[PDB]
Amino acid sequence: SKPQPIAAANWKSGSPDSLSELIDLFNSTSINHDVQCVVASTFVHLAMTKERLSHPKFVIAAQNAGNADALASLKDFGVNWIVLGHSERRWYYGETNEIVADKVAAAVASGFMVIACIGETLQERESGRTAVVVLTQIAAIAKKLKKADWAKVVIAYEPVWAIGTGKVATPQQAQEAHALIRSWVSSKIGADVAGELRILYGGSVNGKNARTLYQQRDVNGFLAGLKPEFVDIIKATQ
Ligand SMILES: [Cl-]
């Protein structure tokens, strides 16, 4: 009754790893269960990653494209997935809920599967404003989409305090977050949509923590940093 899990790998600069070697590792990895694996990379590595990742349960995702011609070109190039709204887009680049929403709408229109990221800050979490922050974030996204559009959409729930910090959310925190996201999608979009929607957890997921997190009722996989432990995160999606 859970939808198809997704294990998404999100590439970031100054990774100590070789991308190529990580691709080689992923290519060798047998994945017995049904899961869509996604290697999201930055522009300059898109061509190398496409060239080189041939695991068929893997798709390449672009990241943060917001231009008509660039979306169109990525699609041309055979890139069908895109990650958008990721934490630093919001807290650093100044991408508002609306800018992310418009990027998500543009990508869907261009035939992309979209991993749309949402998530609260340390401060937002601490003052109990997680729900309102994250529901505001997704509400902005939902405003720009139509019901059919949700088939192309994936939500990555990422607490900002958990991204890259070694501080993972607890199964109860991830479940609470995912549950309210899905409750909101249910009530505001439809229970068929909430039902089919992949809500992924991200922020300091590793091998050990992942399977407990995937056990949670509303967790449909993970958005994780592209690192060799990602393989163990893939396995946890059962
Ligand atoms: Cl497996």
Side-chain angles (χ1 to χ4, degrees):
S1 269
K2 262 190 208 180
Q4 181 202 46
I6 290 162
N10 192 66
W11 191 98
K12 38 179 90 166
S13 274
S15 179
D17 298 297
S18 173
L19 210 206
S20 151
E21 285 193 13
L22 264 31
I23 291 169
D24 291 349
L25 168 69
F26 298 158
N27 279 346
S28 64
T29 295
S30 283
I31 300 154
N32 308 303
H33 78 288
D34 188 21
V35 56
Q36 185 63 238
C37 306
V38 189
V39 167
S41 198
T42 201
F43 186 73
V44 299
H45 301 311
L46 240 25
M48 24 202 303
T49 318
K50 173 93 178 160
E51 195 11 293
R52 294 270 327 256
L53 185 61
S54 45
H55 199 304
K57 299 209 177 175
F58 282 75
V59 295
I60 310 296
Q63 285 172 164
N64 302 312
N67 194 259
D69 293 349
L71 259 0
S73 164
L74 282 164
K75 208 61 182 60
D76 255 320
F77 195 70
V79 171
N80 301 294
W81 284 65
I82 190 159
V83 187
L84 297 162
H86 198 258
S87 54
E88 81 292 319
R89 287 305 132 168
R90 309 170 175 268
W91 63 256
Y92 189 84
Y93 297 99
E95 295 178 42
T96 63
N97 296 96
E98 289 70 41
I99 287 177
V100 173
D102 294 344
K103 285 197 185 195
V104 167
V108 175
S110 304
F112 290 78
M113 291 291 307
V114 181
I115 303 167
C117 307
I118 64 186
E120 82 300 341
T121 67
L122 180 60
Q123 298 305 113
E124 292 159 0
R125 178 155 287 270
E126 301 186 322
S127 46
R129 291 192 56 248
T130 303
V132 46
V133 158
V134 300
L135 299 187
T136 294
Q137 298 183 140
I138 196 169
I141 285 159
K143 193 186 204 200
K144 297 285 163 66
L145 303 181
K146 64 212 174 294
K147 186 168 161 151
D149 280 338
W150 285 87
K152 310 299 293 270
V153 176
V154 178
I155 293 300
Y157 169 71
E158 300 189 309
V160 182
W161 46 267
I163 298 172
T165 57
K167 194 162 169 258
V168 78
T170 61
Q172 20 284 145
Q173 281 175 321
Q175 174 51 33
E176 192 199 61
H178 282 53
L180 60 97
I181 293 168
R182 199 185 301 280
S183 257
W184 184 94
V185 175
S186 190
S187 320
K188 268 64 197 295
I189 322 286
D192 44 349
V193 173
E196 298 291 336
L197 179 72
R198 276 75 63 89
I199 316 179
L200 315 180
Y201 173 82
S204 296
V205 195
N206 61 54
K208 104 204 162 223
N209 65 38
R211 166 116 38 183
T212 310
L213 287 161
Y214 195 85
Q215 267 7 256
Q216 300 324 115
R217 186 188 65 194
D218 289 295
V219 179
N220 316 288
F222 307 100
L223 184 59
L226 185 54
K227 297 175 295 82
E229 11 320 313
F230 182 66
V231 165
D232 297 323
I233 294 173
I234 294 155
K235 289 172 193 139
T237 55
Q238 330 169 239

